[model samples]
Target: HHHHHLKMKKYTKTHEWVSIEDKVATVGITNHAQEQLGDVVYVDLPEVGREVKKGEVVASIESVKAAADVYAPLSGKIVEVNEKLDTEPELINKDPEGEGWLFKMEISDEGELEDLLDEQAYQEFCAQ
Candidate 1:
């Protein structure tokens, strides 16, 4: 249980994950989200300077099966994007929680983080 929280990430109702540190939150799709999407072929990310709203579509992921929207967990300005996905979209299928993260955002409202689900709750949410 202790170890679980160390790598814990917040999940949105949309199935995206948020990993945070130093006030910047790293965003990505969950493993389950990727598994459902099948083989990823392309990722459309927001520009680094763009301001996004919570629950707003921030990006779109194109998989072999279909395209899915990636939403912002908390309102913020996109600080960085994973350009590697431009050439290697499969990285999301390989490691969605790690190197395959979509973008980094400087959070606009720290309080919005509370609205996200924790690991256990997220797992249960996905099970349904």
Candidate 2:
């Protein structure tokens, strides 16, 4: 069976992942989310200056099996987008943490991030 999850230290209940550094958090979906998406064919990332609320759909993934939303893990203005993924959707399956990252937000409210799961909690959550 597919792992159906990637053990990221930071996670959104909507299945988005985050790697926070400084005031910014890099975000993406879990491997489990990607498996559900099937073979990703294209990704629609947010614009560089777009504002997004936590848990809102900021981007989308087009897969051979279905199209899915990529949610904002934190509320803030989108600071950057992973332009590389536009050319390589497989990066979602190959490196969900690094090059596969969807976008970054300058973290509008740090407290909001605390609501997302940590690695252990996320693992157990996925198991359920």
Candidate 3:
């Protein structure tokens, strides 16, 4: 379960989460995603200002066990990328939702939130 106080983020079935506020969203893989991926070794991310659709692959996370695409949870223009991963990529496994955030984007449509899953619903979905 995600932290109760952290303003539950909207999620994709693919395991990406988008922390949205003021039409901008911070994106990252869910803790469940990182756990399934195992120890991350590197991240290949999109450039700032890149346009992405709701389900576009925004980044690549290579773990000791597997390489996976981190898809965008909402359509937007990539506004920021997390540069810290250039050195300590393990931070992604350490804090998948906080310091491990992948990118920030100004969403193309605020209504996209309606298509995303809430925390509880996502947990239930992940349970399967």
List the candidates' TM-scores in order: 0.91, 0.88, 0.91
- For all candidates in order, the CA lDDT equals 0.90, 0.82, 0.88
**C-alpha lDDT (0 to 100) for residue 34 of candidate 1:** 95
Pick by lDDT: 1 or 2, better one = 1
TM-score of structure candidate 2: 0.88
lDDT string, candidate 1, 22-119, tens digits: 47899999999899999999999999999999989989999988999998999989999999999999999999999999999988887888899999
Candidate with better lDDT, 1 vs 3: 1
Estimate the TM-score for candidate 3. 0.91
Q: What is the lDDT of residue 68 in candidate 1?
A: 98
Mark the 10 consecutive residues where model 1 has the least summed lDDT: 1-10
Ranking by lDDT: 1, 3, 2
- How many pairs in model 3 have backbone atoms within 3 A of each other, for residues 3 or more apart or on separate chains, i.e. clashes? 0
lDDT of 3 by residue, 98-125 (tens): 9999889988887778899998899999
